[PDB]
Coordinates of N, CA and C in Angstrom, one line a residue:
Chain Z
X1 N -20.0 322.1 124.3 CA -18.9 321.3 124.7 C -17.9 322.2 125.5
X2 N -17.2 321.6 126.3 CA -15.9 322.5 127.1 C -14.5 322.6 126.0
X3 N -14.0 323.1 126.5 CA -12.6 323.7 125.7 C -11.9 322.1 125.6
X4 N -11.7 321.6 127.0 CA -11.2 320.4 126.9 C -11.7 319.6 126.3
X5 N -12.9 319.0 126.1 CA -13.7 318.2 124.9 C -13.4 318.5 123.5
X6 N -13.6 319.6 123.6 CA -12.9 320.0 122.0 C -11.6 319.9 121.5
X7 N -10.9 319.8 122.5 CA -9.7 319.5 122.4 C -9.0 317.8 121.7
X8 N -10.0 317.2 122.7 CA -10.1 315.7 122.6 C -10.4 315.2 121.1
X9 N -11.7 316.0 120.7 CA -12.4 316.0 119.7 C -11.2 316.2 118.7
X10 N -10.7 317.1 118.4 CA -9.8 317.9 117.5 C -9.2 316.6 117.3
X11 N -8.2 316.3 118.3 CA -6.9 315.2 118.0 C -7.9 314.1 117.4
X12 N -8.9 313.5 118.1 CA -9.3 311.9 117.5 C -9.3 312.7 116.2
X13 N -10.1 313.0 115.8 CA -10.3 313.7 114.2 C -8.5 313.3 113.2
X14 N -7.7 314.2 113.9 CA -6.5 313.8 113.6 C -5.9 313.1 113.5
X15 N -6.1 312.0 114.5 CA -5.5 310.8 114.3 C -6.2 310.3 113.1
X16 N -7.5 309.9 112.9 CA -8.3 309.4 112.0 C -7.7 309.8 110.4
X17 N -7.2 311.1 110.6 CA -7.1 311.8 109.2 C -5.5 311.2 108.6
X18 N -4.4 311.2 109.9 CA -3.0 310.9 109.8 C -3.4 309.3 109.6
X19 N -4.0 308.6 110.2 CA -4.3 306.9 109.9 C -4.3 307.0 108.1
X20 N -5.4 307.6 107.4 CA -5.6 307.7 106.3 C -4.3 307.7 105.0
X21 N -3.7 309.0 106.0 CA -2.5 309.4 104.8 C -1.2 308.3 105.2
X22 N -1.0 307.8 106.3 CA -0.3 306.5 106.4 C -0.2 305.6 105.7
X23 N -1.8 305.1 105.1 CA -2.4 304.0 104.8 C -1.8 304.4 103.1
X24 N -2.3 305.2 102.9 CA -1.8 305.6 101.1 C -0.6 305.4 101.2
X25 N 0.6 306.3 102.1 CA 1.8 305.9 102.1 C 2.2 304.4 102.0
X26 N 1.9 303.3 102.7 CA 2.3 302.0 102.7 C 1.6 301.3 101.1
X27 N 0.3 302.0 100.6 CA 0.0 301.4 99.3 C 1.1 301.9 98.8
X28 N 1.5 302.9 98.3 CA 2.6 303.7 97.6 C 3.6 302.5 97.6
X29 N 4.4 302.2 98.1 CA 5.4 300.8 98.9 C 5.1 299.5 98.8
X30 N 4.0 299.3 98.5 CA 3.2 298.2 98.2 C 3.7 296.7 99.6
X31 N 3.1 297.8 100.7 CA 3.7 297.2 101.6 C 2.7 296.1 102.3
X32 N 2.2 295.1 101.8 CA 0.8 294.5 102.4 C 0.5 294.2 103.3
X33 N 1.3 293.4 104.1 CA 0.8 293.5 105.2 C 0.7 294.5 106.4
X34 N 1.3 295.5 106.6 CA 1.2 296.6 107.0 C 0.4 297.7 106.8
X35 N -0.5 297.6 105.5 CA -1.3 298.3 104.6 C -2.8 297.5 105.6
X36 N -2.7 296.6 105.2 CA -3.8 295.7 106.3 C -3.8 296.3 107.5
X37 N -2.8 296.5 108.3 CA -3.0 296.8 109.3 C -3.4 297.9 109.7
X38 N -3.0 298.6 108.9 CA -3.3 299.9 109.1 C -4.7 300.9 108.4
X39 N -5.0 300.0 107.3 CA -6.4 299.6 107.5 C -7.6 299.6 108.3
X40 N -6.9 298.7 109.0 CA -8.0 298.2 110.5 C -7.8 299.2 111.3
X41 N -6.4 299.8 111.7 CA -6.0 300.8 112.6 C -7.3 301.9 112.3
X42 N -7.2 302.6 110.9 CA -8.0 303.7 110.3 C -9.4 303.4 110.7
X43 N -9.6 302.2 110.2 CA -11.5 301.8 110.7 C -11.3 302.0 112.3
X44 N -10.3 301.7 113.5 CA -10.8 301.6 114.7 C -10.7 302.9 114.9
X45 N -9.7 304.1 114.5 CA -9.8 305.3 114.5 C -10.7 306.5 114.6
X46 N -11.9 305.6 113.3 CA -12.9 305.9 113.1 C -13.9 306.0 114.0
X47 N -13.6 305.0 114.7 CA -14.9 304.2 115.6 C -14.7 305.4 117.1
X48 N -13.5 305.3 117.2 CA -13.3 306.4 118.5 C -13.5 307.6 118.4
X49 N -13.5 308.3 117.3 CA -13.5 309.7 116.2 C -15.0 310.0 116.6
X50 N -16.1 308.9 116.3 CA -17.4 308.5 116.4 C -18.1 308.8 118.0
X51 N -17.2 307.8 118.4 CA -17.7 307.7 120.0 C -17.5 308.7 120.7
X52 N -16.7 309.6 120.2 CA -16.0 310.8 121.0 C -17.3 312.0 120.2
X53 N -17.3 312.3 119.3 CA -18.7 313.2 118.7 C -20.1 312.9 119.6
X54 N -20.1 311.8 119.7 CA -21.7 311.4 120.1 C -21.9 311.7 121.8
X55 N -20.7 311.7 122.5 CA -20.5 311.8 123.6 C -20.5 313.3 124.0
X56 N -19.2 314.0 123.1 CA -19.5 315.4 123.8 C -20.4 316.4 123.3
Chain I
X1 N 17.6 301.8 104.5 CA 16.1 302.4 104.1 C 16.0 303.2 103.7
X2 N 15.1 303.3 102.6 CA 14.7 304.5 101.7 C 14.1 305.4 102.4
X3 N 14.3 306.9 101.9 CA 14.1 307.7 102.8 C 12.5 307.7 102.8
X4 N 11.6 306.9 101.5 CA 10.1 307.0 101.3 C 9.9 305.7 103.0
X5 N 10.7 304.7 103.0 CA 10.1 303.9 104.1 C 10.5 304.6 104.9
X6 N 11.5 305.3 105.6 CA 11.7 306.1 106.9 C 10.6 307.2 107.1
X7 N 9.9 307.8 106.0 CA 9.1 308.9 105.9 C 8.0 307.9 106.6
X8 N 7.1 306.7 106.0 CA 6.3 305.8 106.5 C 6.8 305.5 108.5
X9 N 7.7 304.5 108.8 CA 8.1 304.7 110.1 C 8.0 305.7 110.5
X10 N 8.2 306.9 110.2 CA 8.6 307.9 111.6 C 6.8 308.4 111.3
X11 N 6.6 308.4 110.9 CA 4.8 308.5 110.7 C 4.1 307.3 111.9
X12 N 4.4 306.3 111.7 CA 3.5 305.2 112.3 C 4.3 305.4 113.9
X13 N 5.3 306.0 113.8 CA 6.1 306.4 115.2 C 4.6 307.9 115.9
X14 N 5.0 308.3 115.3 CA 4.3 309.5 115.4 C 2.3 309.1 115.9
X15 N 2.2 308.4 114.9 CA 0.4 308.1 115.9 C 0.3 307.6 116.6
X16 N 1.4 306.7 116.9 CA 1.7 305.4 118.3 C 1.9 306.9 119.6
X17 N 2.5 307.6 119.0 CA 2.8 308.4 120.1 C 1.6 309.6 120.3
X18 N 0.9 309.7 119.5 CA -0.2 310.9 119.6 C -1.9 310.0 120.4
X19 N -1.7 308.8 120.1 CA -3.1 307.8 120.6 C -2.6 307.9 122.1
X20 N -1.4 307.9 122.5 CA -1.0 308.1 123.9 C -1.2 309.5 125.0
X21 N -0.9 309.9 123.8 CA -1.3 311.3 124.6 C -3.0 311.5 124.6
X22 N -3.5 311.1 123.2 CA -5.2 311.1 123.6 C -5.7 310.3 124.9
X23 N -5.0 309.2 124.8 CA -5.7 308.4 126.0 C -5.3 309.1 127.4
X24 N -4.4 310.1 127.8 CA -4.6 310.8 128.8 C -5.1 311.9 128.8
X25 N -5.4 312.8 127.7 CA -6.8 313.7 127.5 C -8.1 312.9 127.9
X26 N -8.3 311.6 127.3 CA -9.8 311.4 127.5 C -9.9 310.7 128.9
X27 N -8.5 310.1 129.5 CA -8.5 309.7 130.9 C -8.9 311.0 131.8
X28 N -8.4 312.0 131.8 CA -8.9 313.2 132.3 C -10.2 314.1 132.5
X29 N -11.0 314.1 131.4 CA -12.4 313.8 131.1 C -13.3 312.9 132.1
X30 N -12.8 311.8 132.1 CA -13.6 310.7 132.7 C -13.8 309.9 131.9
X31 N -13.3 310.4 130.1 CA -14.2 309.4 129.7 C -14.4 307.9 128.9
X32 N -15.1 307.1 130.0 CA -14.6 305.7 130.3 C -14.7 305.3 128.9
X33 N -16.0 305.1 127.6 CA -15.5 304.2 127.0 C -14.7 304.7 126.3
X34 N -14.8 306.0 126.1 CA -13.6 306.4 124.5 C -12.4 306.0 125.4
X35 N -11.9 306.3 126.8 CA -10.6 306.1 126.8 C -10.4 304.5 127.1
X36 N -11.5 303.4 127.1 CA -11.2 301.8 126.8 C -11.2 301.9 125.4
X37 N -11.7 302.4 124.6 CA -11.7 302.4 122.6 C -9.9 302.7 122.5
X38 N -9.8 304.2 123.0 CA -8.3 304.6 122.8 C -7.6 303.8 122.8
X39 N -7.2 302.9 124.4 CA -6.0 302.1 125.0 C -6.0 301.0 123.7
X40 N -7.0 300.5 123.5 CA -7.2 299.6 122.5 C -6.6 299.8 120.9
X41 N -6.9 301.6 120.7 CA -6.1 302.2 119.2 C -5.1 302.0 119.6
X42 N -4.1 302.5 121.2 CA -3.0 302.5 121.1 C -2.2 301.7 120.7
X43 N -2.6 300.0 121.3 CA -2.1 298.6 121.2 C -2.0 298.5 119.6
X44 N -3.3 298.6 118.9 CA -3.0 298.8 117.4 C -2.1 299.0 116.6
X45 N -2.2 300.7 116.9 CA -0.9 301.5 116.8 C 0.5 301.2 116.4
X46 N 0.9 300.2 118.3 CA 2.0 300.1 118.4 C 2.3 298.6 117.4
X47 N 1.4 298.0 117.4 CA 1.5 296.6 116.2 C 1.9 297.3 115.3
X48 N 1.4 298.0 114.3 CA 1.8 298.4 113.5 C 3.0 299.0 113.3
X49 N 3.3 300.1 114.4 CA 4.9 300.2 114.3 C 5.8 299.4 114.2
X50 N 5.7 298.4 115.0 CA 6.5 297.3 115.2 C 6.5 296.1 113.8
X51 N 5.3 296.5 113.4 CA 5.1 295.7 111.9 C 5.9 296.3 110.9
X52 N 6.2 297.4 110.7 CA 6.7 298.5 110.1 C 8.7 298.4 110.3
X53 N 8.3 298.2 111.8 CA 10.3 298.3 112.2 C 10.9 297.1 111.5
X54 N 9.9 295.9 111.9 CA 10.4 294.8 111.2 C 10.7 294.5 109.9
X55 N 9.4 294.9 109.1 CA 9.9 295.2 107.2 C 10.8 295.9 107.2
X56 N 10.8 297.4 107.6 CA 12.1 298.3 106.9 C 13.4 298.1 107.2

């Protein structure tokens, strides 16, 4: 991979990881609907985290 | 607001703003689907924040 792919790579990873620790925060709060969403946020996180490995 | 829900918001502030900056890393790359996946996390994202400013 190039420096810049890895770079890309790095943050998706990150985002996916900060999605996670959000998502506990809002259970913490018992904040539901927001927890949902961010939920789904984390699964699409994932999906790009994914697409971005297979690619570079 | 409690400072645990400001800790939450400035968090969901914070990925809304980092999915933005990915999506012009992987715009720069070229690369087309992760950065149609990204624009897509971003819009997410920013639901969420916005779901967030509203509760707190």
């Amino acid at each position: 991979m190039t420096k810049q792919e890895k770079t890309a790579l790095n943050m998706a990873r990150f985002i996916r990881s900060q999605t996670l620790t959000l998502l506990e925060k809002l259970n913490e709060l018992d904040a539901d609907e927001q927890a949902d969403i961010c939920e789904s946020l984390h699964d699409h996180a994932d999906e790009l985290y994914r697409s971005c490995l297979a690619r570079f």
